[PDB]
Structure of Diphtheria toxin:
Amino acid sequence: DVVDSSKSFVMENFSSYHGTKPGYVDSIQKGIQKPKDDDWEGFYSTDNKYDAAGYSVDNENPLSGKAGGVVKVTYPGLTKVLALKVDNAETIKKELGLSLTEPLMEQVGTEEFIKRFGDGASRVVLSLPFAEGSSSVKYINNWEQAKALSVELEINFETRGKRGQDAMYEYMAQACASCINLDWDVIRDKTKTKIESLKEHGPIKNKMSESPNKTVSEEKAKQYLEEFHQTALEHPELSELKTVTGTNPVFAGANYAAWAVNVAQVIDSETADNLEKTTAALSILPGIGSVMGIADGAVHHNTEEIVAQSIALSSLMVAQAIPLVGELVGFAAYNFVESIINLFQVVHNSYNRPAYSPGHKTQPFLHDGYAVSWNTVEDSIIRTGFQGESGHDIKITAENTPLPIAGVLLPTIPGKLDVNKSKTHISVNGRKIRMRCRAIDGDVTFCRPKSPVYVGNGVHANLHVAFHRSSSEKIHSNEISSDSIGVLGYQKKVNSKLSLFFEIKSM
Amino acid sequence: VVDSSKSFVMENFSSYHGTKPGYVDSIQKGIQKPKDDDWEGFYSTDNKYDAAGYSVDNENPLSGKAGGVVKVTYPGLTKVLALKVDNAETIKKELGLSLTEPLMEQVGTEEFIKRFGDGASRVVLSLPFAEGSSSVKYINNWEQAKALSVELEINFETRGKRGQDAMYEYMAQACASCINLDWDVIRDKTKTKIESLKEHGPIKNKMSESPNKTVSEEKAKQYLEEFHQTALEHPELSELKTVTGTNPVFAGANYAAWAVNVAQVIDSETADNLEKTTAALSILPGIGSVMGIADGAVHHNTEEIVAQSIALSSLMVAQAIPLVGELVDIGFAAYNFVESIINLFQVVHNSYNRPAYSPGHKTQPFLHDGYAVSWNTVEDSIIRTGFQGESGHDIKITAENTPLPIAGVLLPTIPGKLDVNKSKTHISVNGRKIRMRCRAIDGDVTFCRPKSPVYVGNGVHANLHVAFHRSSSEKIHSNEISSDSIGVLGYQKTKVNSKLSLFFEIKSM
């Protein structure tokens, strides 16, 4: 009941990975020994060496400190991996036949437990899901049993001699072999070059002349820095940047200007002189998607050359913004570039990782003030291969004022998938609103509410879509055009489109 | 598939049925069938106000007339059999029924009644009425439904009110906070105010300044903002001037945008029919500006202020029609526009009357500063009490577009009864597990910072996992707990952080 037999197995030479902090890379290869929540006291490892690497960073400087390494640990002989459906120790003790007083992970390393659950293996290791939205597992080893592990070096980020956490993040990026895999040495080099060239430019040094170079108001400051942004963006070392930041307003000069002003306001002398404190301060500021070129679910600035341009331009602007709104030194070219680079790497790594997009599974789709999502994972799956009914629930609301829901565009397959016009309805804070559904196409039906639907702060709707299958025959790739259900918001002539993406699947 | 906790036998079981106009007097002569069929049956509900929302002219559902509600009763004993699922195929298998015959035919069978009726004369099926409602829908077999007596609860046509006021005034009885407006008063006051406004010297004056022929949106808005400012000096609009001066949602700009946007979608054919006018207006954005609805509250909740807002908006629509209108009447402003917009007020007021979880409660998202955060499941939002040991609570976090930070989270603590498990509490960003550093800031609030920068955005979500430990087995009493929310902090903007609140309830077991 608490033990999942689909993720449990006996294995010979069971291996797993362990992230190791700086200094312990060589020490640990002589054996796992505990140092000097107790139910879970134990030695931790994971089946994913890239997830292990995230545990390898200096515990005294966790945002920007050095990464240590990853080792691989192997049990000889036969090991039982005992996967648990819950991580509540007391539920595990009661559901198994265990003393509710003895710590769960003490019991796990005793011959009694190894008898009843090891299936003749020499050891039980507990297995739990690593994290929400990760398919990796976490292994929990009894500390004394773990003394049998052999330890091999997988990688030593310090051996690589790279700056910052370049080595750790470059290792993780291997997981994706669509994959941001940037050379941060190139970028750092190109970046230092651009700053120097930009500082010599005639029109740049000329617009620095116009700088009040004294404390002023924030709106004066933004206006000068918007000017500086326009001037500096004409340098031919920033010419690709000028082109790729022209259309999308997130990349505008005014957002670079707010960024530089936000940076100068939170950096004091004590902060600029320490890299951990700079990373902490910068990491809570809004607007960084302007300098990173990240908008609308995409990393647009995904070349070494264009990332260096963006980081160079922003370094200069921070250099300009400190006099006008701050008080210090130099920071702009030194610790500002180092922390910003680390922040770049955090976010790129998020975007490399497998992840459901807005409107997929239970991830909300946010658009035009609305928020919609599938209520459960199964709601987003249209099952096929049977004659009968299914129901699917979509949650809908909005952020403030009453916004309308005009209707929903639903897929139909001429004969193999049809809308149940009687069970399809929408419910607004519990008021059930029937729908009028007319096909506009062989492949699309449009359902309108029979009474006005509005959602907003404190008003939400549940849209219930009910499908009926006539044929028992499965639905084939070609048969379906759309991967999405289109909920329509207010009209602007067009409607705001809110997309809930489904998947066809058998039983 | 059968919830025994919603099933029961009852004497004189009664329910309610909403009745379209024309069938109100006729239905009282008995439930006869008319000339998914698993479900073909006679439908009723336990909540008479939910029934009232089935009573509107099918041909004109947006704006049409409302018939009534009748109460139907079985004599003797009835079995109410509450079902967990609405899939009839699944119901026939797990009840051992013919997988071919219509489920609601079988339910009217003498054999089915023996098996499941507990010695009641017949069986009625019971199902949840809708998401977000505590009502039930009852499905009656048609043959058995011949046994029902039928009494009038209310005939809306007979109250002789305009539009759908009878129905919405009836539904507002349910909440006895509560918008219970007299729409006759509001209608009369509104007609009165439109009259006086059109006579004002400065109105007729700034009205005579109108380009009075098609122009551009930016120029049309600019004049209507001017017009709006002049109109709001009239004394018949003085309360409105006061209550709309602060909230930017109620500003002249947004009355002007509302009115431009109306004139653009109303052509002579739409304008000459209330149903199509209501359809058209019902898909526009910005109605909250004239309704006085913002930030989760209905601010215009007196007859006087609603009539003032409707009157001013009627005038502005009249001014916007020459500058942007395909139509030529301007009579629309004072007739079908007012009728129609009144109906939309009623709709939205009713939504806010109805019991509903607020942002940040249960699985309702909390939408703020471009973030969306919610409890993953209803149980996550409940901190159970009265035991020693552990619990976990999942909060989902994302954002609409560019990467926004999560600076940390504020968590409640009670000296002995409730502690942050600093080991199990983490945050997971597209699968990347990030540990926290938790410090107490006060005896009742602990603050947890992530140990690697957290950013969320389109395509990047986080699961904040909060682990609580109780050392005492004593229950938490209300005095112990200051906050009813967990505060997730976003970006920093005097230095402050954006606050995202997830509201929890303390329960036993």
Q: What stands out?
A: The radius of gyration of chain B is 29 Å. Chain B touches chain A through 97 residues (CB under 8 Å).
